[PDB]
Each structure stands twice: as structure tokens, then as C-alpha cells.
Design a protein around this ligand. Structure first.
Ligand SMILES: NC(=O)C1=CN([C@@H]2O[C@H](COP(=O)(O)OP(=O)(O)OC[C@H]3O[C@@H](n4cnc5c(N)ncnc54)[C@H](O)[C@@H]3O)[C@@H](O)[C@H]2O)C=CC1
Ligand SMILES: Cc1cc2nc3c(=O)[nH]c(=O)nc-3n(C[C@H](O)[C@H](O)[C@H](O)COP(=O)(O)O)c2cc1C
Ligand code: SF4
Ligand code: FES
Ligand code: NA
Ligand code: NA
Lengths: 155, 418
């Protein structure tokens, strides 16, 4: 297994950014998940080499941090807040609208591999509850019609 | 450039300090910041001794806005009695439920935070500073990286800053989904490229932190105060709010209010005033049942006349105000809090690892009416026994809010017991 040059170059930028290479581990894993739509298990041995870390260290780190997904490839992660304030103000309405539009529930991927619904804890936008992200983009859910418009922008 | 979409959180200020620019929901770049006299406090600070700056921050009564309210000057004094090198860390992990105060500084007025970091780093003799921002704030990350390049361009970062002989680089690190990485020792473990496992304290970071060196960890909102303290002087800063708990405070208000958002107010403001005077009262003008101080405390409608300060009888915490009204089920809300701690314990300590899991798993059975008498007695026991042997605040408080709902809303819990 080998990192495509355009990804490897970004990884090296992160590794060169902090005073110590190993500090770059989370930025590299974010970058790998960004490129592939998940963390390929085969990616972890080469990353460990570049960070000059043992593989078991890198595997342990991937396991620890909930944003990293080794299981499901998805072009777009729909992160849905299931914490206290979004629950009070209508997480269940958001999930119902997501199911009506995409045919999937939390933890599931659409058949085309386009969308995965990821239930997450408080996204720190509680005044705008109920909150969701589509990759790096963050939104208040208003209604199914409004959610359908937002989702149409991700192709 | 273009940044990821951010919801436009409402922001309102009576003091026009932290939110002078951040009350407008957009990125304020270095020119706008400079136009408002930005980075003049840094120029003033670099013509003072580090010791003088610590003394001003001490005399200001500035307390940790991260939620514990530890005196900021006194933290810095502990750091500088230990030999260097020293590190300065800005904690931008902000992952407490209901808590969105720090992000509006980061995303709208990043230079206020950066100016604060440079002054604080100089005060403690740190030539290397870090921002650790949660992974779920990607826009905050890109905005801070761009803002840091702007500061470098204008000679506020790099070597020999404005001929002072003071060197500083600021590195932006990202979290990857762990609440525990906001705990200052877990944060430092994450900066070192490891899992977010809190360390036994003492030692505190000011004695042994990043690479074992003296390290100050301060919250975004704490650091954002430092430019005002230097600009105004500690004396004028102490004119803001009560002289014992002085300065502006950000109050992120959410749930059943008409105007959810962040409020910049003095800390003599009462909880009742936050909800009814500033946040426009309750949705449907329904009676307040409870206020969740993030996932830390639950105040009843009998506790609304408390100051929003770090006093023993005060609200304290992050200043986070989640409002529940008369029709909100307290046990349903307690379940969401249990689910949070279940998802976030790092598992190093046994009572925390099993207690956070069992508290959630049993409270779900109670909520769904599937609990045995043993499950009920079990739930009570585990709630009182998450804390023992815990080496950080998560284990210490994972049962705290839920215990307060059991004491303050017994009639509601008893309904479920049948
Ligand atoms: N903003 C957010 O999103 C979140 C905030 N929190 C807050 O975290 C708080 C608990 O934080 P902790 O760090 O566990 O509290 P703490 O009270 O143990 O420590 C507070 C600060 O003072 C320092 N300190 C305390 N005693 C010291 C001593 N003897 N010598 C030197 N320095 C000393 C610590 O190093 C730390 O920086 C809670 O009150 C909660 O509000 C928790 C989770 C998320
Ligand atoms: C589980 C846990 C999570 C924490 N998360 C944060 C956080 O996201 N941001 C923060 O500033 N402090 C957080 N804290 C508090 C820090 O450990 C520390 O007290 C604070 O960052 C010091 O800065 P301050 O004195 O300016 O408040 C957390 C504490 C615990 C126990
Ligand atoms: S108290 Fe809980 S979160 Fe804190 S170190 Fe122990 S197991 Fe981890
Ligand atoms: S509870 Fe959903 S964003 Fe905070
Ligand atoms: Na601008
Ligand atoms: Na914002």
C-alpha cells in the first residue's frame, strides 16, 4: 500500500508543522479520512513509518478518537447531535426528515456510499438546535423541505 | 478565503468588550481588528516586564473562564517559579453540552484570542504556544490558521516581535471527537501524539506539562480578557461587574428561551436576569422547571436569584444556561446527561469506566419502564460511586447533575419508580 503523491505531500506538511513529528498524528488521520472517506486499515502502517511511531500506537489512537471511522466509506458524513439541547429542541424530527429523504437511520450508509448518518454528542451550537454537520459544514435543522435543499448542494 | 458553513449564533453584549466585533456573525480580519486599536495592548505589554503583566492579571481578579474559575494570575505565578522552557496552551476543546461561548470569539474575532495568547506567552516566558481546537470546529481551525498568518505578516508573531527580543510561534492542533481531551492533562497527552488519558494531579501542568515542562493551560475566553486588562489597566478592568468577580463573562443560553445565544454580561447579573431580562424569557411564557449548567449542575426554579459568578453560592461553571420548562421530563433529560458521560469516560479508572456505562444503561431501563427493583437500587448505588479513585473531573462529576435531579425533582423520579 502507498499514499497517492497529492495526499503524501499534505501528510508531510502536517508532520513538518509541529516541532515533533508525532504531534501531527490527528491532523494526518483527519487528512487520510478526508481523502478516502474513512481510515483504510492498510493506511496505518505507512502513517506510523512517516510519524516514526509503532503501528500499535497509531492503531490505539485511531480506536480512541470517535471522528475516525475504519468501517464505512462515505463521501459525506451527516453528523447529527443527539445530546441534551438538540434532543429537547427536535433531534427526532431531524432524524425522521433524514430517513424520509435518504432512506437511512443513524450508523447506516446510503446504497451509493454518498451519505452516512453519524450520531454525535454536543456540537457546541446548542442555541441553533437541532444541529447537524455535512462534512465540515454546520447547520440548524428547520424542516424536511429546508434539509432537502441543503442536501441537494452535496453531489 | 471561503470557510465551512457556521450557524449564525445570536450574540448580545452590555459591555462591548469580548463581543465588540464578535456580536456580528462573520470573520473580522486583521485590518478591522487594527482599526479598533487591536494589537496596541501587545505593544504596551512588550514595554512592560513579564512580572508586571502577571501582577496586573493577578490584581484584575480574572478567573478561569473554562469553568473551574481558578485565579489566572496565580496560575501564571506557579508556572514562572519553575525553570524553563515553559509552554502556553489555549484550550479551545469546548465540548460541554450547551457550551458555545468560545467558538464565537474563535470564528468572529480570532485576533482578540491571538493577541491574548502572545501577551500571556510573553508574561510566562513561553516561546511556543498551542491552540487545541476540537475536531468538530473545522471552520474555527481554518480561521485561526489564516489569522495566525495575518499576525505573522504584521510582525506580531515570529522572532524578535516588534524589536522586543521576544520569540513566539503558535501551533494549531485539532481534536478528533473526545470530550476528555478538554481536560488539561488529556489535552497535553493529545498534543504529545497520544490517546487523551488524563494524568494524576499533582503535579499540575504549571509544574509538569507538555514534554514534562512548566505549562499554563487557559481557556479561550480567559485569554480573550488579557488584552483588555493591559489596555485598560487592572484597576479600570475591576470597575466591570463586582470587584471580587470582575470583567465581562460570556453566557451561552439555549433550550426553552425566546432568544437563545451568547450574552456578554457582568457576573453580578442573576440567573433570572439572564433568562428573562436578556434571553427574552421562556418559549410560550411557560414556567422554568430547571437550568442545566452544562452537564455539571441542575438548578431548580427556586434557585434563579443567584449571581452568575464564581462565589460559593453563585452559578459558576462555564456560565452555560440550558433552560427546561414545566412540560420537559427531568428523567428524559437526566438520561441524555448519563448518555453523554457513558460516551466520554476514557476508562483508566474502574469506578468511572463501569459507573458511567451502568448509570446510562440502568437509567435507560428506568426511562423505558423495563427496570427491575434491583436495577433501581443499582442505578442509585452506581450514581453515588462513579467518583472513587477518579484521577480527573469527569469521574468526579459524572453523577453530580443526576443526583441533583433526584434531590430536587423526587415526585418526577417516583412516577418512573412505579
Ligand atoms: N468549557 C468546556 O467545554 C468544558 C468545561 N469543563 C469545566 O471543567 C471544570 C473542571 O476542570 P479541572 O481542570 O478538573 O478543575 P480544577 O479546579 O482542578 O483546576 C482548574 C485549573 O486550576 C489549576 N490548578 C488547580 N489547583 C492548582 C494548584 N494547586 N496548583 C496549580 N494549579 C492549580 C489546574 O491546573 C487547572 O488549570 C468544570 O468546572 C467544568 O465547568 C468541563 C468540560 C468541558
Ligand atoms: C472532562 C473535562 C473536560 C474539560 N474540557 C474543557 C474544555 O473543553 N475547555 C476548557 O477550557 N476547559 C476544559 N476543562 C477544564 C480544564 O481542565 C482546565 O481547568 C482549563 O482549561 C483551565 O483554563 P482556565 O483556568 O482559563 O479555565 C475540562 C475539564 C475536565 C475535567
Ligand atoms: S475519571 Fe474517568 S475520564 Fe477521568 S481519567 Fe478516570 S476514567 Fe478517565
Ligand atoms: S446539544 Fe446539540 S449542539 Fe449542543
Ligand atoms: Na473582513
Ligand atoms: Na460562530
Amino acid at each position: 500500500f502507498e499514499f497517492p503523491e497529492e495526499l503524501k505531500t499534505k501528510l508531510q506538511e502536517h508532520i513538518n508543522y509541529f516541532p515533533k513529528k508525532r504531534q501531527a498524528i490527528l491532523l494526518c488521520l483527519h487528512e487520510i479520512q478526508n481523502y478516502y472517506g474513512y481510515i483504510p486499515p492498510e493506511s496505518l502502517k505507512p502513517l506510523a513509518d512517516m510519524l516514526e511511531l509503532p503501528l500499535n500506537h497509531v492503531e490505539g489512537v485511531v480506536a480512541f478518537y470517535d471522528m475516525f471511522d475504519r468501517e464505512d466509506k462515505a463521501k459525506y458524513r451527516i453528523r447529527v447531535c443527539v445530546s441534551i439541547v438538540c434532543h429537547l429542541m427536535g433531534t427526532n424530527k431531524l432524524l425522521k426528515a433524514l430517513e424520509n429523504i435518504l432512506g437511512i437511520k443513524p450508523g447506516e450508509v446510503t446504497p451509493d456510499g454518498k451519505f452516512k448518518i453519524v450520531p454525535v454528542q454536543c456540537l457546541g451550537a446548542c442555541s441553533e438546535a437541532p444541529v447537524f454537520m455535512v462534512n465540515d459544514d454546520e447547520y440548524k435543522f428547520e424542516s424536511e423541505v429546508q434539509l432537502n435543499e441543503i442536501l441537494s448542494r452535496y453531489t | 478565503r471561503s470557510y465551512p458553513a457556521i450557524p449564525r449564533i445570536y450574540a448580545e453584549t452590555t459591555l462591548n468588550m469580548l463581543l465588540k466585533r464578535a456580536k456580528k456573525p462573520r470573520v473580522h480580519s486583521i485590518d478591522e481588528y487594527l482599526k479598533d486599536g487591536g494589537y496596541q495592548a501587545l505593544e504596551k505589554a512588550l514595554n512592560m516586564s513579564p512580572e508586571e503583566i502577571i501582577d496586573w492579571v493577578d490584581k484584575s481578579t480574572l478567573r478561569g473562564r473554562g469553568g473551574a474559575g481558578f485565579p489566572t494570575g496565580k496560575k501564571w505565578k506557579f508556572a514562572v517559579q519553575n525553570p524553563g522552557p515553559r509552554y502556553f496552551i489555549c484550550n479551545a476543546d469546548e465540548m460541554e453540552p450547551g457550551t458555545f461561548k468560545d467558538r464565537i470569539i474563535i470564528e468572529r474575532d480570532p485576533h482578540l484570542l491571538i493577541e491574548g495568547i502572545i501577551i500571556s506567552s510573553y508574561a510566562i516566558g513561553a516561546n511556543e504556544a498551542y491552540i487545541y481546537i476540537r475536531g468538530e470546529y473545522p471552520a474555527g481551525y481554518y480561521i485561526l490558521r489564516d489569522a495566525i498568518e495575518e499576525a505573522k505578516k504584521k510582525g506580531f508573531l515570529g522572532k524578535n516581535i516588534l524589536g522586543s527580543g521576544f520569540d513566539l510561534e503558535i501551533y494549531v492542533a485539532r481534536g478528533a471527537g473526545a470530550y476528555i481531551c478538554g481536560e488539561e492533562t488529556a489535552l497535553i497527552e493529545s498534543l504529545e501524539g497520544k490517546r487523551g488519558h488524563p494524568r494524576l494531579k499533582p503535579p499540575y501542568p504549571v509544574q509538569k506539562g507538555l514534554w514534562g515542562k512548566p505549562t499554563v493551560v487557559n481557556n479561550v475566553e480567559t485569554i480573550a480578557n488579557v488584552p483588555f486588562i493591559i489596555s485598560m489597566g487592572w484597576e479600570e478592568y475591576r470597575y466591570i461587574g463586582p470587584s471580587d468577580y470582575a470583567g465581562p463573562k460570556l453566557f451561552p443560553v439555549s433550550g426553552k428561551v425566546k432568544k437563545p445565544g451568547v450574552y456578554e454580561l457582568p457576573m453580578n447579573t442573576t440567573l433570572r436576569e439572564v433568562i428573562f431580562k436578556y434571553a427574552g424569557g421562556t418559549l410560550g411564557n411557560k414556567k422554568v422547571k430547571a437550568v442545566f449548567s452544562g452537564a455539571l449542575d441542575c438548578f431548580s426554579s427556586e434557585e434563579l436569584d443567584i449571581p452568575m459568578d464564581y462565589s460559593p453560592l453563585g452559578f459558576g461553571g462555564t456560565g452555560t444556561v440550558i433552560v427546561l420548562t414545566e412540560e420537559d421530563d427531568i428523567v428524559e433529560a437526566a438520561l441524555k446527561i448519563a448518555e453523554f458521560y457513558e460516551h466520554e469516560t476514557c476508562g483508566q479508572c474502574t469506578p468511572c469506566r463501569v459507573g458511567c456505562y451502568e448509570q446510562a444503561n440502568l437509567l435507560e431501563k428506568i426511562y423505558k419502564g423495563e427496570a427491575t427493583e434491583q436495577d433501581w437500587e443499582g442505578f442509585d448505588f452506581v450514581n453515588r460511586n462513579i467518583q472513587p479513585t477518579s484521577i480527573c473531573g469527569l469521574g468526579a462529576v459524572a453523577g453530580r447533575l443526576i443526583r441533583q435531579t433526584l434531590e430536587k425533582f423526587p415526585e418526577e423520579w417516583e412516577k418512573y419508580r412505579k
